[PDB]
């Protein structure tokens, strides 16, 4: 996600508003981030009780 | 040459034992990384046309192939716990299904685009 973000950022001007492609990339980044954070949270409670 | 090299590189994950999970995942994901990096570099050459050429189609098929290898290993690791009878012959099937499918793709692509 970061490497594609750079390879996308090498093309456009520096506009302050958020574009549609910026919203989509941020949504995708937040989804991947939430998946990794979810894995962290399921790795934390894993030892106390394996049902969760 | 580099995209076919990266695809043949992604192929080698089938020869690794299905128990070494970090090994096969690392190979597959590193291959998706290099394919992603390679895609943008080639595409810069020509303008930002909206139709598909015979070169972004090629890198798209290579990227889906690498992706297909990785998700196939994902289903393999999912299925080894459920039923081993189906997951035993998955690698033996993949080792012959991926190179033949790629050679037929190469055949059809090169013939269809060099006849024109
Ligand atoms: C799969 C592993 C071990 C990690 C992951 O990221 C890492 O830093 C580890 C590394 O071993 C080294 C680094 O190349 C790696 C990568 O980007 O994917 C993987 C590779 C291979």
Range of the domain at B60: 1-116
> Could you give the 3-state DSSP secondary structure of residue B70?
helix
Does ligand 1 have an atom closer than 6 angstroms to the CB of B37?
no
Number of domains chain B contains:
1
For B83, the token pair is 């039923």
In eight-state DSSP terms, residue B12 is G
The H or E element containing residue B10 is: helix B2-11
Q: Resolution reached, in Å? A: 2.9
To the nearest whole Å, the CA of A45 is away from the closest chain B CA by: 22
Give the whole-angstrom CA distance, residue B20 versus residue B64.
24
Q: How far is CA B96 from CA A17, A21, A38, B67, B73, in A?
A: 51, 40, 37, 17, 15
Other CB atoms within a 10 A radius of the CB of residue B73 amount to 22
> Which residue from A23, A7, A29, A30 is spatially nearest to B35, judged by alpha carbons?
A7
Does ligand 1 have an atom closer than 6 angstroms to the CB of B47?
no
Q: Nearest chain A Cα to B41, which residue? A: A7
For A24, the token pair is 């989509």
Q: Obtained via which technique?
A: cryo-EM
Q: How far is CA B94 from CA B5, B7, B88, in A?
A: 18, 14, 11
HSE-CB at A41 with a 13 A cutoff on CA atoms is 7
> Which residues precede gaps in chain B, with C-N > 2.5 A?
none
Does ligand 1 have an atom closer than 6 angstroms to the CB of B26?
yes
Give the whole-angstrom CA distance, residue B15 versus residue B75.
16
Q: Nearest chain B Cα to A3, which residue? A: B37
């Amino acid at each position: 996600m970061t490497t594609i973000n750079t390879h996308l950022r090498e093309t456009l001007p520096k506009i302050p508003y958020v574009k549609a492609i910026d919203m989509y990339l941020m949504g995708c980044f937040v989804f991947v981030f939430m998946a990794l954070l979810e894995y962290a949270l399921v790795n934390y409670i894993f030892f106390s009780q394996p049902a969760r | 040459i580099p995209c076919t090299l990266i695809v043949v590189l992604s192929w080698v994950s089938f020869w690794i034992n299905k128990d070494a999970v970090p090994a096969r995942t690392s190979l597959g994901i590193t291959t998706v990384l290099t394919m992603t990096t390679l895609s943008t570099i080639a595409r810069k050459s020509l303008p930002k046309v909206s139709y598909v050429t015979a070169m972004d189609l090629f890198v798209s098929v290579c990227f889906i192939f690498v992706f297909s290898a990785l998700v196939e290993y994902g289903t393999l690791h999912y299925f080894v716990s459920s039923q081993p009878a189906r997951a035993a012959k998955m690698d033996s099937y993949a080792r012959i299904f991926f190179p033949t499918a790629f050679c037929l793709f190469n055949l059809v692509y090169w013939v269809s685009y060099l006849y024109l």
